[PDB]
């Protein structure tokens, strides 16, 4: 279901909404009516997701994937043991134990791939924190404390300061309280409240207080219009819960690769099974051959490799404080065809601070850097220190005592955001503001209000002698300019000029073009001739002067972009990753911060910018001229899917503002529908649904709420964007590394299938056993395969295009060619060389092994003539065959040495890129250690069917493992010398 | 679907890749056959490089049986027809007609003699001569059966056959008052062979076994050893021993164990046919 | 040659080879 309306009856007046629910505006509602309407609309507790799979996820995961074949093989092993116990001699445990260990393999694979496919979604329990249990309601004309679970629609609910509202309500009477939403819009800026319908949009209308919000400063009463699931944020919660998730790119690639390999395995298995049946094998022979094919062709120890690769990725990136929740997400951040961003928190510091200032007819840039890098402004000028005095004195906020242990930019202060920003700037610039305020005692002040748009305060001078009364004044620039008469430059005082006023207007317009609420300061020193020390001071009765003041300076306090965000955004865009900015803020500030950060490059303008520059209406200019576009959220409601897709296709760098959370989900879905892989970053509760829809969701740690961080795939604990650019580079690295590890593991399949192919097509003794297949897959294709995940790729990652999600698959027809076509064939060829060497060193000439399998495995015959003329009994030659199995396994390890050496890098040679990986050498040594230990431990041949072999036979695989190394080096040399050639097209996996 | 007559089957043109794989597989086959020929160069044609995997030979039996048990009704020819045909087909090679003088075969010691050799393994000498094993040694059944008289005279003689190993001469025990007490046996030139399975536990000596072979003693003659290989000693006949039962009862599953002792013969545990030999006899009327 | 090719001795040598290779490999991780 789709819910994107969020319609509310804001336009209707108080009487109509009171009567439509038949609720008294002044007497609230009765207990009986409340009960009989609760029996209809239900309780306020939003419905949690009913489906809570406890352990069925694990069962479904083990039943699916690349296993069904393993379960079939286990069933066939049990069937073979059952057959052997009813027709043959005393039953042997060599098949029941094989079935048990195969079931153990499938169980461990299922429980090990469970670690990565863990949908950690618990968004239901993040909203009980809001809507506190107790709310003050007005029932039967009486104030009552009532539980928030049973509060109904259509009842008078009061709203004090710091008390989050219990339900969506339209205010009937606003008593001077300011509310800050911070839930759907996503900012800390407070909003006024008034019953008047100021805006037609219910989101922007001032007569409604949204759910899970508190009117911060004051108290107000209203009538609930909707509650429960029929709530806008309840609707958001239900949409997020029912949205579920999209399959990650690594999940899709793994699914396709498993499908392909399982299809090949089942096709070859059924083909050679019917071939064996045609040849005339008994049922036991047919089932054991099928088990061999199934366990050989299927790489059981492979889905346990990618999981550990991703886990090592998570471990490496956790040292940069990136708490990864979903193990697959580490791959998705690599692709990120597009990146969606948020305005507040992700790109800013979430609080307003001073950024620009103007004095001496000069613009000065306030430095976010603590050391004032780049000589931002002078500090010894009298005008600057006076301006600092003025900004400090006018504040009506006080720092918390005893909080000096935190840097001044990170200390919480109670009061208005604007005055907080001013006082923080003064503290950072001059020093201890509290001592400053102590020095200059306050004697008279005037409150600041919207009806005034100015505040003034009377203080003394810094020097104790001649304490002339200084009246400091702060307000809008235009009012202070109108009340001004002289300008203060470098301590001296000049008079206003028409050119000076024009320059001031130009500077004010320039500052306002940055999407900032500019403030103007002033201060007049009252003459002692007319205003002496013993002068009466009042508030309601005027006794000061209002005109003939003197302007001192302008002040800009936009919320700053992050310290490391611009360079990181530039790096991400230079990596071919398009960046889209979405928010619910005002378009002017959004475009200003987009220009400042780097989302919109210099020299590129929107349609309205071109229209203003060319003094032509927007209608008469073609939108195709402007590559960068910024749109409001009001016209997106009149936009269909085709319009959004066209906007995404044509415009190259877009910035969306004033968008509801459901509109954010619409935007991300439209971005994803174009075949891209979208990654949205945010911190508020508004983008909680979008965070789920995007293939990877990134939430800020310190500056993000609990809901945003627990609904995200990855959390940035350090709260840095350079972390996310490092993440995308490392994701590209891990994808390119997985494409090598998968190729490495798959090459060992051919030397395990080919022996069965010759056993069925040439009638020779079984070269490679079945248990030794498990030994190879889980003992020699685990440590090196995991160790491959550590090495860093070639230096080309700086100049790499984003991965194409539909042509550059994880496993393609050009990688099966490398594994199954060339590299794998040399493996099996070396294995067969060792086979023939040791069968020829015991009496069986290589030219006679054909056509001997029929009597080789026969139990009755005990006089099998070999080539040299001697004869063997059954177990006496079965011992030789088992020794040859051990030789095949050892030769596999020996040639896997060179396989690892040549699969280390895709383009750069070993002589160039170098063996700087300290773990690959350990893995190569571990291949030898387990092979020698497992083939020489006493008391193991009776169980694992592993016999000792002479030292010379260790060398059988040397002159073939050397060949594969030289061949891969030659093909890499051809690759490097001939870019874009046929070799690159058909062999570059 | 993979359309055709427009661009081709999944692109391709299927020539460059196919030719590449064909030439690569040809080179792989060439290098493989070269390497296997090189390995063939370093192995002798007269002795296996490692004979350890060949142990003191398994005392296999000549009458081939699938379930390792001989069951037949003596009154029905088809009951033992399979055994009779297998025995005669095996022993057709041992007929005296195939054994002739004039550098085909040679006369050899009637009394079990020393293990005479013929020369070095080197090819400087051609096919070395071997003794002859006439069928006249087999008998004791009061009838010219040679291959097998075919009558229900107890059981079809399950003549044992000690497996042959290239360049291996069995060493008979040399001691006094050993673990075995055969009435007709001397320490050299004879390997003692007895046939009894689970004696005194459940068998309790059901039947009496009579041994007849070469030298009128229950043992393999040593003068035939050692074997010199298939290429150097064609038409080689190895020593044979014959066993017969007379007072053998019916309607019982009796295990019988025919083992051959020797200082150069060692036993095992997982192998039930190496050195010692087991078989079951089933007769029903 | 029917006498043991070294068995009960190649096992000791192989175990020694395995353990020394494991020790050399595990040395590089710490260093």
mmCIF file of N, CA, C and O in Angstrom, chain A residues 307-379:
data_model
loop_
_atom_site.group_PDB
_atom_site.id
_atom_site.type_symbol
_atom_site.label_atom_id
_atom_site.label_comp_id
_atom_site.label_asym_id
_atom_site.label_seq_id
_atom_site.Cartn_x
_atom_site.Cartn_y
_atom_site.Cartn_z
ATOM 1 N N UNK A 307 31.674 -14.038 3.294
ATOM 2 C CA UNK A 307 31.228 -13.542 4.591
ATOM 3 C C UNK A 307 32.405 -13.061 5.430
ATOM 4 O O UNK A 307 32.352 -11.985 6.034
ATOM 5 N N UNK A 308 33.487 -13.840 5.469
ATOM 6 C CA UNK A 308 34.650 -13.416 6.240
ATOM 7 C C UNK A 308 35.344 -12.238 5.572
ATOM 8 O O UNK A 308 35.926 -11.391 6.255
ATOM 9 N N UNK A 309 35.309 -12.157 4.241
ATOM 10 C CA UNK A 309 35.858 -10.982 3.569
ATOM 11 C C UNK A 309 35.115 -9.722 3.994
ATOM 12 O O UNK A 309 35.728 -8.697 4.317
ATOM 13 N N UNK A 310 33.784 -9.789 4.022
ATOM 14 C CA UNK A 310 32.998 -8.643 4.463
ATOM 15 C C UNK A 310 33.235 -8.346 5.940
ATOM 16 O O UNK A 310 33.259 -7.180 6.348
ATOM 17 N N UNK A 311 33.406 -9.386 6.757
ATOM 18 C CA UNK A 311 33.686 -9.170 8.174
ATOM 19 C C UNK A 311 35.035 -8.492 8.376
ATOM 20 O O UNK A 311 35.176 -7.626 9.246
ATOM 21 N N UNK A 312 36.042 -8.877 7.590
ATOM 22 C CA UNK A 312 37.338 -8.212 7.667
ATOM 23 C C UNK A 312 37.244 -6.774 7.180
ATOM 24 O O UNK A 312 37.916 -5.886 7.715
ATOM 25 N N UNK A 313 36.414 -6.526 6.167
ATOM 26 C CA UNK A 313 36.142 -5.154 5.751
ATOM 27 C C UNK A 313 35.546 -4.342 6.893
ATOM 28 O O UNK A 313 35.959 -3.204 7.151
ATOM 29 N N UNK A 314 34.567 -4.918 7.589
ATOM 30 C CA UNK A 314 33.952 -4.229 8.717
ATOM 31 C C UNK A 314 34.966 -3.970 9.821
ATOM 32 O O UNK A 314 34.989 -2.885 10.409
ATOM 33 N N UNK A 315 35.815 -4.957 10.114
ATOM 34 C CA UNK A 315 36.833 -4.779 11.143
ATOM 35 C C UNK A 315 37.813 -3.676 10.769
ATOM 36 O O UNK A 315 38.185 -2.853 11.612
ATOM 37 N N UNK A 316 38.247 -3.646 9.507
ATOM 38 C CA UNK A 316 39.174 -2.608 9.070
ATOM 39 C C UNK A 316 38.541 -1.227 9.157
ATOM 40 O O UNK A 316 39.170 -0.278 9.637
ATOM 41 N N UNK A 317 37.290 -1.095 8.709
ATOM 42 C CA UNK A 317 36.676 0.225 8.664
ATOM 43 C C UNK A 317 36.148 0.661 10.029
ATOM 44 O O UNK A 317 35.915 1.856 10.239
ATOM 45 N N UNK A 318 36.005 -0.268 10.977
ATOM 46 C CA UNK A 318 35.594 0.108 12.323
ATOM 47 C C UNK A 318 36.679 0.873 13.065
ATOM 48 O O UNK A 318 36.369 1.584 14.026
ATOM 49 N N UNK A 319 37.940 0.742 12.648
ATOM 50 C CA UNK A 319 39.005 1.557 13.218
ATOM 51 C C UNK A 319 38.849 3.032 12.876
ATOM 52 O O UNK A 319 39.499 3.870 13.511
ATOM 53 N N UNK A 320 38.016 3.362 11.892
ATOM 54 C CA UNK A 320 37.617 4.733 11.610
ATOM 55 C C UNK A 320 36.234 5.050 12.163
ATOM 56 O O UNK A 320 35.633 6.053 11.770
ATOM 57 N N UNK A 321 35.718 4.205 13.058
ATOM 58 C CA UNK A 321 34.433 4.407 13.726
ATOM 59 C C UNK A 321 33.283 4.499 12.719
ATOM 60 O O UNK A 321 32.612 5.522 12.583
ATOM 61 N N UNK A 322 33.072 3.394 12.011
ATOM 62 C CA UNK A 322 31.926 3.211 11.124
ATOM 63 C C UNK A 322 31.230 1.931 11.577
ATOM 64 O O UNK A 322 31.509 0.845 11.065
ATOM 65 N N UNK A 323 30.325 2.061 12.543
ATOM 66 C CA UNK A 323 29.644 0.902 13.115
ATOM 67 C C UNK A 323 28.714 0.317 12.064
ATOM 68 O O UNK A 323 27.628 0.842 11.811
ATOM 69 N N UNK A 324 29.139 -0.780 11.448
ATOM 70 C CA UNK A 324 28.381 -1.418 10.379
ATOM 71 C C UNK A 324 27.368 -2.368 11.004
ATOM 72 O O UNK A 324 27.733 -3.255 11.782
ATOM 73 N N UNK A 325 26.094 -2.184 10.663
ATOM 74 C CA UNK A 325 25.035 -3.046 11.178
ATOM 75 C C UNK A 325 24.758 -4.212 10.232
ATOM 76 O O UNK A 325 24.834 -5.377 10.633
ATOM 77 N N UNK A 326 24.432 -3.912 8.979
ATOM 78 C CA UNK A 326 24.234 -4.935 7.963
ATOM 79 C C UNK A 326 25.571 -5.224 7.295
ATOM 80 O O UNK A 326 26.205 -4.314 6.753
ATOM 81 N N UNK A 327 25.995 -6.488 7.331
ATOM 82 C CA UNK A 327 27.318 -6.834 6.828
ATOM 83 C C UNK A 327 27.447 -6.574 5.333
ATOM 84 O O UNK A 327 28.546 -6.279 4.851
ATOM 85 N N UNK A 328 26.349 -6.679 4.584
ATOM 86 C CA UNK A 328 26.411 -6.457 3.145
ATOM 87 C C UNK A 328 26.644 -4.995 2.787
ATOM 88 O O UNK A 328 27.176 -4.712 1.707
ATOM 89 N N UNK A 329 26.276 -4.067 3.675
ATOM 90 C CA UNK A 329 26.317 -2.648 3.337
ATOM 91 C C UNK A 329 27.715 -2.190 2.952
ATOM 92 O O UNK A 329 27.860 -1.270 2.139
ATOM 93 N N UNK A 330 28.751 -2.832 3.498
ATOM 94 C CA UNK A 330 30.122 -2.422 3.206
ATOM 95 C C UNK A 330 30.395 -2.486 1.713
ATOM 96 O O UNK A 330 31.236 -1.741 1.195
ATOM 97 N N UNK A 331 29.696 -3.366 0.996
ATOM 98 C CA UNK A 331 29.880 -3.443 -0.446
ATOM 99 C C UNK A 331 29.071 -2.357 -1.145
ATOM 100 O O UNK A 331 29.566 -1.710 -2.072
ATOM 101 N N UNK A 332 27.847 -2.109 -0.672
ATOM 102 C CA UNK A 332 26.942 -1.215 -1.387
ATOM 103 C C UNK A 332 27.521 0.188 -1.501
ATOM 104 O O UNK A 332 27.416 0.828 -2.554
ATOM 105 N N UNK A 333 28.162 0.675 -0.435
ATOM 106 C CA UNK A 333 28.735 2.014 -0.465
ATOM 107 C C UNK A 333 29.762 2.172 -1.575
ATOM 108 O O UNK A 333 30.033 3.299 -2.000
ATOM 109 N N UNK A 334 30.344 1.074 -2.052
ATOM 110 C CA UNK A 334 31.225 1.162 -3.203
ATOM 111 C C UNK A 334 30.498 1.585 -4.465
ATOM 112 O O UNK A 334 30.962 2.460 -5.199
ATOM 113 N N UNK A 335 29.351 0.960 -4.745
ATOM 114 C CA UNK A 335 28.649 1.250 -5.991
ATOM 115 C C UNK A 335 28.126 2.682 -6.032
ATOM 116 O O UNK A 335 28.682 3.518 -6.751
ATOM 117 N N UNK A 336 27.095 2.974 -5.239
ATOM 118 C CA UNK A 336 26.563 4.323 -5.028
ATOM 119 C C UNK A 336 26.571 5.167 -6.302
ATOM 120 O O UNK A 336 27.287 6.160 -6.418
ATOM 121 N N UNK A 337 25.771 4.734 -7.278
ATOM 122 C CA UNK A 337 25.647 5.502 -8.512
ATOM 123 C C UNK A 337 25.237 6.942 -8.225
ATOM 124 O O UNK A 337 25.685 7.871 -8.907
ATOM 125 N N UNK A 338 24.388 7.148 -7.219
ATOM 126 C CA UNK A 338 24.043 8.480 -6.744
ATOM 127 C C UNK A 338 24.045 8.474 -5.223
ATOM 128 O O UNK A 338 23.891 7.424 -4.594
ATOM 129 N N UNK A 339 24.225 9.654 -4.634
ATOM 130 C CA UNK A 339 24.238 9.812 -3.184
ATOM 131 C C UNK A 339 23.248 10.904 -2.814
ATOM 132 O O UNK A 339 23.387 12.048 -3.262
ATOM 133 N N UNK A 340 22.261 10.558 -1.992
ATOM 134 C CA UNK A 340 21.327 11.535 -1.450
ATOM 135 C C UNK A 340 21.844 12.052 -0.116
ATOM 136 O O UNK A 340 22.366 11.287 0.700
ATOM 137 N N UNK A 341 21.702 13.356 0.102
ATOM 138 C CA UNK A 341 22.237 13.994 1.293
ATOM 139 C C UNK A 341 21.143 14.772 2.010
ATOM 140 O O UNK A 341 20.081 15.054 1.452
ATOM 141 N N UNK A 342 21.417 15.106 3.266
ATOM 142 C CA UNK A 342 20.538 15.922 4.087
ATOM 143 C C UNK A 342 21.193 17.269 4.365
ATOM 144 O O UNK A 342 22.401 17.450 4.197
ATOM 145 N N UNK A 343 20.373 18.223 4.802
ATOM 146 C CA UNK A 343 20.836 19.586 5.049
ATOM 147 C C UNK A 343 21.405 19.742 6.456
ATOM 148 O O UNK A 343 22.577 20.091 6.624
ATOM 149 N N UNK A 344 20.590 19.480 7.472
ATOM 150 C CA UNK A 344 20.980 19.720 8.852
ATOM 151 C C UNK A 344 21.679 18.494 9.422
ATOM 152 O O UNK A 344 21.180 17.372 9.302
ATOM 153 N N UNK A 345 22.832 18.716 10.045
ATOM 154 C CA UNK A 345 23.558 17.643 10.693
ATOM 155 C C UNK A 345 24.593 16.978 9.813
ATOM 156 O O UNK A 345 25.782 16.967 10.148
ATOM 157 N N UNK A 346 24.157 16.410 8.688
ATOM 158 C CA UNK A 346 25.089 15.706 7.812
ATOM 159 C C UNK A 346 26.111 16.656 7.201
ATOM 160 O O UNK A 346 27.304 16.340 7.148
ATOM 161 N N UNK A 347 25.668 17.822 6.738
ATOM 162 C CA UNK A 347 26.561 18.781 6.103
ATOM 163 C C UNK A 347 26.893 19.973 6.989
ATOM 164 O O UNK A 347 27.836 20.707 6.680
ATOM 165 N N UNK A 348 26.155 20.182 8.071
ATOM 166 C CA UNK A 348 26.370 21.302 8.974
ATOM 167 C C UNK A 348 26.714 20.787 10.367
ATOM 168 O O UNK A 348 26.894 19.588 10.588
ATOM 169 N N UNK A 349 26.810 21.718 11.309
ATOM 170 C CA UNK A 349 27.020 21.388 12.710
ATOM 171 C C UNK A 349 25.724 21.382 13.509
ATOM 172 O O UNK A 349 25.771 21.230 14.735
ATOM 173 N N UNK A 350 24.581 21.564 12.847
ATOM 174 C CA UNK A 350 23.232 21.542 13.409
ATOM 175 C C UNK A 350 22.932 22.741 14.301
ATOM 176 O O UNK A 350 21.791 22.881 14.758
ATOM 177 N N UNK A 351 23.900 23.617 14.556
ATOM 178 C CA UNK A 351 23.657 24.838 15.309
ATOM 179 C C UNK A 351 24.214 26.028 14.544
ATOM 180 O O UNK A 351 25.195 25.910 13.805
ATOM 181 N N UNK A 352 23.566 27.174 14.721
ATOM 182 C CA UNK A 352 23.966 28.388 14.029
ATOM 183 C C UNK A 352 25.167 29.022 14.715
ATOM 184 O O UNK A 352 25.249 29.056 15.946
ATOM 185 N N UNK A 353 26.109 29.508 13.909
ATOM 186 C CA UNK A 353 27.264 30.249 14.394
ATOM 187 C C UNK A 353 27.583 31.366 13.413
ATOM 188 O O UNK A 353 27.105 31.382 12.277
ATOM 189 N N UNK A 354 28.411 32.300 13.864
ATOM 190 C CA UNK A 354 28.763 33.469 13.067
ATOM 191 C C UNK A 354 29.680 33.047 11.928
ATOM 192 O O UNK A 354 30.639 32.294 12.133
ATOM 193 N N UNK A 355 29.384 33.527 10.722
ATOM 194 C CA UNK A 355 30.167 33.201 9.538
ATOM 195 C C UNK A 355 30.720 34.412 8.805
ATOM 196 O O UNK A 355 31.805 34.317 8.227
ATOM 197 N N UNK A 356 30.012 35.539 8.804
ATOM 198 C CA UNK A 356 30.454 36.729 8.092
ATOM 199 C C UNK A 356 30.194 37.957 8.950
ATOM 200 O O UNK A 356 29.360 37.940 9.856
ATOM 201 N N UNK A 357 30.918 39.031 8.646
ATOM 202 C CA UNK A 357 30.693 40.302 9.320
ATOM 203 C C UNK A 357 31.169 41.421 8.411
ATOM 204 O O UNK A 357 31.888 41.188 7.438
ATOM 205 N N UNK A 358 30.745 42.642 8.727
ATOM 206 C CA UNK A 358 31.074 43.793 7.898
ATOM 207 C C UNK A 358 31.333 45.009 8.768
ATOM 208 O O UNK A 358 30.513 45.350 9.627
ATOM 209 N N UNK A 359 32.473 45.656 8.540
ATOM 210 C CA UNK A 359 32.798 46.918 9.193
ATOM 211 C C UNK A 359 33.945 47.581 8.444
ATOM 212 O O UNK A 359 34.669 46.936 7.680
ATOM 213 N N UNK A 360 34.085 48.891 8.668
ATOM 214 C CA UNK A 360 35.047 49.726 7.947
ATOM 215 C C UNK A 360 34.847 49.639 6.438
ATOM 216 O O UNK A 360 35.811 49.703 5.669
ATOM 217 N N UNK A 361 33.589 49.503 6.011
ATOM 218 C CA UNK A 361 33.245 49.292 4.605
ATOM 219 C C UNK A 361 34.015 48.108 4.029
ATOM 220 O O UNK A 361 34.496 48.140 2.895
ATOM 221 N N UNK A 362 34.128 47.046 4.825
ATOM 222 C CA UNK A 362 34.906 45.878 4.440
ATOM 223 C C UNK A 362 34.240 44.626 4.988
ATOM 224 O O UNK A 362 33.731 44.624 6.113
ATOM 225 N N UNK A 363 34.256 43.563 4.186
ATOM 226 C CA UNK A 363 33.676 42.280 4.565
ATOM 227 C C UNK A 363 34.771 41.398 5.147
ATOM 228 O O UNK A 363 35.860 41.281 4.572
ATOM 229 N N UNK A 364 34.486 40.779 6.289
ATOM 230 C CA UNK A 364 35.426 39.910 6.979
ATOM 231 C C UNK A 364 34.778 38.553 7.208
ATOM 232 O O UNK A 364 33.633 38.472 7.672
ATOM 233 N N UNK A 365 35.512 37.494 6.884
ATOM 234 C CA UNK A 365 35.003 36.133 6.969
ATOM 235 C C UNK A 365 35.351 35.543 8.329
ATOM 236 O O UNK A 365 36.531 35.345 8.640
ATOM 237 N N UNK A 366 34.331 35.266 9.137
ATOM 238 C CA UNK A 366 34.553 34.556 10.387
ATOM 239 C C UNK A 366 35.048 33.148 10.087
ATOM 240 O O UNK A 366 34.507 32.463 9.213
ATOM 241 N N UNK A 367 36.078 32.718 10.806
ATOM 242 C CA UNK A 367 36.742 31.456 10.511
ATOM 243 C C UNK A 367 36.178 30.346 11.386
ATOM 244 O O UNK A 367 36.166 30.459 12.616
ATOM 245 N N UNK A 368 35.709 29.274 10.745
ATOM 246 C CA UNK A 368 35.321 28.085 11.493
ATOM 247 C C UNK A 368 36.531 27.420 12.135
ATOM 248 O O UNK A 368 36.398 26.768 13.179
ATOM 249 N N UNK A 369 37.708 27.570 11.532
ATOM 250 C CA UNK A 369 38.927 27.031 12.115
ATOM 251 C C UNK A 369 39.256 27.771 13.406
ATOM 252 O O UNK A 369 39.102 28.992 13.500
ATOM 253 N N UNK A 370 39.712 27.018 14.409
ATOM 254 C CA UNK A 370 39.890 27.583 15.742
ATOM 255 C C UNK A 370 41.096 28.511 15.822
ATOM 256 O O UNK A 370 41.132 29.398 16.682
ATOM 257 N N UNK A 371 42.086 28.333 14.948
ATOM 258 C CA UNK A 371 43.309 29.124 14.999
ATOM 259 C C UNK A 371 43.253 30.369 14.119
ATOM 260 O O UNK A 371 44.269 31.059 13.987
ATOM 261 N N UNK A 372 42.099 30.662 13.514
ATOM 262 C CA UNK A 372 41.932 31.804 12.615
ATOM 263 C C UNK A 372 42.902 31.715 11.434
ATOM 264 O O UNK A 372 43.704 32.616 11.179
ATOM 265 N N UNK A 373 42.810 30.600 10.714
ATOM 266 C CA UNK A 373 43.696 30.365 9.583
ATOM 267 C C UNK A 373 43.413 31.358 8.462
ATOM 268 O O UNK A 373 42.265 31.739 8.219
ATOM 269 N N UNK A 374 44.475 31.779 7.780
ATOM 270 C CA UNK A 374 44.331 32.689 6.662
ATOM 271 C C UNK A 374 44.023 34.122 7.029
ATOM 272 O O UNK A 374 43.324 34.801 6.270
ATOM 273 N N UNK A 375 44.527 34.596 8.171
ATOM 274 C CA UNK A 375 44.358 35.970 8.671
ATOM 275 C C UNK A 375 42.949 36.498 8.398
ATOM 276 O O UNK A 375 42.739 37.477 7.680
ATOM 277 N N UNK A 376 41.973 35.816 9.003
ATOM 278 C CA UNK A 376 40.569 36.072 8.694
ATOM 279 C C UNK A 376 40.185 37.519 8.984
ATOM 280 O O UNK A 376 39.526 38.172 8.166
ATOM 281 N N UNK A 377 40.588 38.041 10.139
ATOM 282 C CA UNK A 377 40.259 39.418 10.480
ATOM 283 C C UNK A 377 41.227 39.927 11.536
ATOM 284 O O UNK A 377 41.864 39.150 12.252
ATOM 285 N N UNK A 378 41.322 41.250 11.620
ATOM 286 C CA UNK A 378 42.182 41.887 12.605
ATOM 287 C C UNK A 378 41.583 41.757 14.000
ATOM 288 O O UNK A 378 40.368 41.617 14.170
ATOM 289 N N UNK A 379 42.453 41.804 15.008
ATOM 290 C CA UNK A 379 42.029 41.696 16.394
ATOM 291 C C UNK A 379 42.425 42.887 17.252
ATOM 292 O O UNK A 379 41.956 42.984 18.392
#
